[PDB]
Amino acid sequence: MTYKLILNGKTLKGETTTEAVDAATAEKVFKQYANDNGVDGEWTYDDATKTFTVTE
Hints:
Blueprint: E1 2-7, E2 14-19, H1 23-35, E3 42-46, E4 51-55
Parallel strand pairs: 1-4
Antiparallel strand pairs: 1-2, 3-4
């Protein structure tokens, strides 16, 4: 299971897919990535199409 993250950072936007066994580990896994960019604030989850999304 691999969800798709959508970075809606104000000064930065992107998107990457990560492999996670559950939604919990998926929240920190992606968060760990965004951190390497400086995008931390509100986090959303689209269980409708397996697509993660975050917006600073």
